[PDB]
Amino acid sequence: PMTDISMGDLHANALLFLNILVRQGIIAISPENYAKFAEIYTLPELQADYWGTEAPVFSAENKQERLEEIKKQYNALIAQIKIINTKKLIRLIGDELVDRGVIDYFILKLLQALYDQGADFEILLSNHGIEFVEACELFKENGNKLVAKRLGNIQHGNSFHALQEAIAAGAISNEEVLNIYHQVYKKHLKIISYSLDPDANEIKVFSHAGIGLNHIRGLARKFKVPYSEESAVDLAKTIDAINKKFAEKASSGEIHTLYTHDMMYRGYAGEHLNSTDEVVAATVWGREYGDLIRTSKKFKITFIHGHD
């Protein structure tokens, strides 16, 4: 009923996420419940780098009790949030999980409420989000635990560490997290996305990091779909095909097969990722994939992405 919502990198800040959803007319929440939400979000016992590296709650003898009381009240607030706009599209440019914010549980519950009440949203694949994907996809492999040791070496994921510790303390269940992963999170994931104006032969391409047409061509090759750039409409059709193949990988629990960990170390380090098999790593890290192509004579394009 207005322009698409495009959110910057949230860094797992659930209150920032809430604020945008309220200010953009997606959700209604009372002022008193908003204040309760902000209070829970900034509880000293949940803040890392406050009295130690760890949030105080995780060194407390009664950590389970503390976390249970926070969790039940948090979920009571979620249950009082109403989605009031199901037509406005919400695009998350990424970093909604596994990042500097307090705990991934908070944004996971928000995503679940958005989905359950019919909001339209999409999540652009990021290096942070990919660690959550891998942890969930390899849950059984890792002995029924959410872990991602090698990916955790290249980025700070306080909010995911807090999730792991809360699960270890018995306050949050693997089954709840995994249900949200499979039922909510993974089917709203896109590698790249777009807004298309067919009459103007113009397209806006959205991605977590800086890419060009060369990345999209590499992705079409990686997923074995035809690449066409004969028009803005044709490029949109190509992007649809790329995301359809990606969703099949999401469904089979095989997103983690689209990269190797050496690609992610070199991605973090800032290197070129020019080999065809590295194109997913090159896209999420915004690294060189051959010559960067940002103009076509056959249509107008603007690229929209986050920064670092």
Author numbering: 24 to 331
From the paper:
IcmW-Interacting Protein B (WipB) is a 60 kDa Legionella effector of unknown function originally identified amongst a cohort of proteins that interact with the Dot/Icm T4S chaperone complex IcmS/IcmW10. Our data reveal that WipB is a modular effector, with an N-terminal Ser/Thr phosphatase domain related to the eukaryotic phospho-protein phosphatase (PPP) family, and a C-terminal domain sufficient to pilot WipB to the acidified LAMP1-positive lysosomal compartments in eukaryotic cells, where WipB interacts with the v-ATPase and the associated LAMTOR1 phosphoprotein, key components of the lysosomal nutrient sensing (LYNUS) apparatus.
The crystal structure of the N-terminal domain at 1.7 Å resolution comprising residues 25 to 344 revealed that WipB harbours a Ser/Thr phosphatase domain related to the eukaryotic phospho-protein phosphatase (PPP) family. WipB25-344 crystallizes as a dimer in the asymmetric unit. In chain A, density for residues 332–344 is missing while the same region is resolved in chain B, This region in chain B interacts with chain A, probably an artefact of crystal packing as WipB25-344 is monomeric in solution. The structure of WipB25-344 is very similar to that of WipA24-435 determined previously (the structures align with a root-mean-square deviation in Cα atoms of 1.9 Å over 279 WipB residues).
